[PDB]
Structures are given as C-alpha cells and as structure tokens.
Specification:
The structure is a homotetramer. By secondary structure, chain A is of the alpha+beta class. Helices cover 20% and strands 46% of the residues of chain A. The complex binds coenzyme A (2 copies). It is classed as hydrolase.
C-alpha cells in the first residue's frame, strides 16, 4: 500500500468508471516554498485512475499499467485536503483513458489531468 | 519537503541540467508493488523546478510547474532511479524541460516533458 | 486560413465555449485512410485559439497555443467531426481548455487539453 | 493525402528515424498569421506514424497514433519546417517517439512526444 500510505490517501468512493480519492496537504507532500508539490497531486491522480482500471477488468487475466499521464497545474494548495475525481472517458480492450480533476477545500481546480492506462495480458 | 520524504539526492546541477536520484523503497512503491508512476513523475517535476529556480532571480520570480506529461516505459522494483532534466527552451515567461528517468541498469523507466512558468513573486 | 482548408464551421460561441465542425474528406485523411490524428488536433487547437480570442481584447493581445495534448480514441472514416472547447481556466497569461471531438454517430474521436498563452 | 494537402516531403528515413519537411504557406497558417500549431503537430504525427510503419509489416499491422503532446516554442511565418522523429522506445504494442520541429533558421518551433499503437489490420 505504501505510497498510498505515505501520502495518507483515503478512497472516498469507487463505482464502475468513477474513483474519488482524497489526501491531506501536509509538509511531507509540500514543495519547499511551500505549496502542495505538483508531483504529489499527479501521484494522487495516477493512483485514482489505476484503481479505476483495476476495478473494471478481470485482474486474474489482465494487468493495468499506467502508460501515459499528462497534467496542467491550475491553482495552488497550502493546507487542508485535496480530492481527485477520476472519471473514465474510454473503456477500450487494450487501453482505458481517464479524466481526472484535483480540487482543494475551496472547490478550486488545483490540477487537471488525463491518464492512459494500458490493459495487458 | 517532498524532496526529503522521497529521500531525493541532488547528484548534479549546472545551468540547464539537473540530475536528481532517489531510492526505490516501499514509501514510493505501488501496493503490488513496483515504483509508483506518480513518484517517478514527482522526481521529474522536482528536477525541472530546481533547474528553473537555478536559472532565475528567485528574489523576483518563482518557477511554477504549468504542464507536465510523461510516458511510463519500464518498471523499477529496486535500486535507484535517476532523473536527468535538460532544458529545451529557456524563455522569458516559460521554460520547457526534457526529463529522462532511468533505473540502475540504465533502463528508461519514464520519459517526461515539463513546462515551467516563470511568474512574479 | 487552415480554417478554410479544412472547411471549419462555427456552430456556436459564447464566453468560455466554442463548438466548431469540419467535414471528414480525403484532404485531411491518412493514406490508409482514416481521419488524420493531426487534423483532429488542428480542429481542437483552432477551437482553443478562437475561444481565447473571444475572451480577450485582440487589439492588444494574441492567443498563441503553448501546449497541446490529445488521446485518439476512435477512428473517423466519413461525415463530420465536431469539437466542443469549454474553458477550464481563464488566467492572465494562460487559458486552459478542455476539448472533445465527436463524429456524426456521436462517437468520441479525440479528446484534448490545450494551454494557450496570452501574449502582447 | 494530408501529406499531399500539406505538401510534405520525406527527406530521410532509416530504422527509428524519420525526417519530413513542408512549406509554410497560407494553406497551413493561423489568421494572424503564423504557421498553424495544429499544422506543425500534424507534421509531427505524420513523421512518427511513418516511423512506426517503417518498423512493422503494414500488411498485417497498422500504426495508429494513440497519444500526442506538444509544446509550441517559436512561431514560423515563412520558409519551410522540418520534423525529425527519433524513436525512444520500440515496444511490441506501442512505440514512443521524440519529435523536434525546426524552421529554416534552425530554430525550435515545436517539440513533441508521440505514442503510437501497433494494431492488427
Ligand atoms: C484507441 C486506439 C489507439 C487503440 O486502443 P484500444 O482502445 O484498446 O482499442 P479498442 O479495440 O478497444 O478501440 C476500438 C475503437 O478504436 C478503433 N480501432 C480499434 N482497432 C483499430 C484498428 N486495427 N484500425 C483502426 N481503428 C481501430 C475503432 O474506432 C474502434 O471503434 P469500435 O469499437 O466501434 O470498433 C485506436 O484504436 C484508435 O482509436 N486510434 C485513433 C485513430 C487515429 O489516430 N488515426 C490516425 C493514425 S496516426
Ligand atoms: C496557472 C499558472 C501556471 C500561471 O498561469 P496564469 O493563468 O496566467 O496565472 P493566473 O494568475 O491568472 O492564475 C491564477 C491562479 O494561479 C495561481 N498563481 C498565479 N500566480 C501565482 C504565483 N506567482 N505564485 C503561486 N501561485 C500563483 C493562483 O492559485 C491563482 O489563483 P487565484 O487567481 O484565485 O489567485 C500558475 O500560476 C499555477 O497556478 N501553477 C500551479 C502550482 C504548481 O504547479 N506548483 C508546483 C510548482 S513546481
């Protein structure tokens, strides 16, 4: 579990094609200046869509591998919690594509992301 | 401080080139688990943020990650990963960075491009 | 001018929203040939720049595509494709746009995110 | 046929490397107008797609652009632009390509990364 544990992530909701994961903005995940590290936000996103893809496939026959991730950083986070909402865009045979939005307490967009997950035999 | 959480070590910095490594330990692994893709990307974003900070007057400007993208190529299970960030474009208001992240065996783990905004303090 | 090359038609505009279409013809196809991924991406970037123009004083500023990314989801063989660009963020120096490109059969062809720099 | 529409010329090919140029004309400009960002990207996607095609049996497989990203660095108002695609990773089911697009003055216009899926015909 341990990066999920390291960042103290909590899965707030899962259903087919939708994953919501939150985490506290603490000093251990901040940049030095310091705001929430952009990379920590991206890691939260990649966690959410990887979990979503795993939930959509037969994990005894297939494995979901993060293939491509991209992200725009929009607003900063200094404290409280941030929440990633991952919604599936495309559930293909060999790839899943996910839209992920990461917000702070004040409902501001911190990071917007798209992730492509490879579905491998 | 994420730099400290992931035990990142700056191996080399010069104008337009930053090399930062970190050990693949449980704290940065996915549950299964290999090195978490998000941790790899965070290492990358740290490297180019540091590079950009090194190119500007940090008493007047702040380097903020604007856009990040990444392809995950191979997995890392142990040893170290090393991010090498080389500047592609040093603009007035934006920097663009190429980042390659390799494991011990010189395998490409993640390749990234990062866009860093240079904003007034 | 490429707008003309691809026969783009603005179907709807309002602040922070653009809907723009184009026909899928041979001139924008791959050899095999499907709708070229690059043509779809060009429709998207067009949507972005137009949208940003509608949001700024174009007598003082110019919207320049800064970063673009895209996932190609389905192929398009014929008919028309329609890009809906909705703004995510209206900043001083950048605008971020979400773009969805669908075909006639209401299939998702391409999804994009665009970052447009606002320059003097 | 887009290649013809854009008047593209294949200047050099070898395994894992493609160079394709095209003129900067009114057919591919923005209204303002410089070279359309979409046109540059289209050139890039053409180059890596050709690169992947040159590495496979195209009577059995087809190279399909899966994910494309690009940073636009400088504008082009005239002359020719040249895209150089070098392969980063040759996997069984995906290829990842680095693409640099330059003008006559040897300036970087667009930098791109392309992920190409290899699908059975
Ligand atoms: C998405 C894609 C990359 C493959 O990944 P995938 O999602 O796991 O493959 P899937 O089988 O699940 O996707 C099915 C759809 O993708 C497309 N597709 C799948 N295999 C294809 C092939 N061998 N040839 C052409 N198109 C194909 C079809 O549009 C298909 O729609 P359908 O399900 O109604 O038949 C690829 O199929 C695709 O859509 N490419 C977009 C077109 C494009 O970029 N053209 C320019 C080439 S540079
Ligand atoms: C969006 C951004 C790239 C600049 O583009 P911009 O749209 O032209 O700038 P804007 O002022 O119009 O954007 C406003 C928001 O961006 C953020 N921002 C803008 N300038 C900033 C600065 N100098 N320092 C910190 N955050 C800033 C703020 O959250 C701001 O929110 P607000 O309007 O409610 O005050 C950048 O400001 C940003 O938000 N980066 C995200 C944080 C990040 O990546 N941190 C990790 C650094 S490696």
């Amino acid at each position: 579990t341990h990066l999920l544990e390291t960042f103290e992530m909590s899965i707030d909701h899962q259903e087919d094609g939708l994953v919501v994961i939150s985490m506290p903005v603490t000093d251990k995940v901040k940049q030095p200046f310091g705001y929430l590290h952009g990379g920590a936000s991206i890691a939260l996103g990649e966690t959410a869509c990887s979990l979503g893809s795993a939930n959509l496939i037969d994990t005894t026959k297939f494995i979901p591998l993060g293939l491509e991730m991209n992200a725009n950083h929009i607003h900063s986070a200094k404290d409280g919690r941030v929440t990633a909402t991952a919604e599936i865009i495309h559930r293909g045979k060999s790839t899943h594509v996910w839209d992920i939005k990461i917000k702070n307490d004040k409902e501001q967009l911190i990071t917007v992301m798209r992730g492509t997950v490879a579905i491998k035999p």
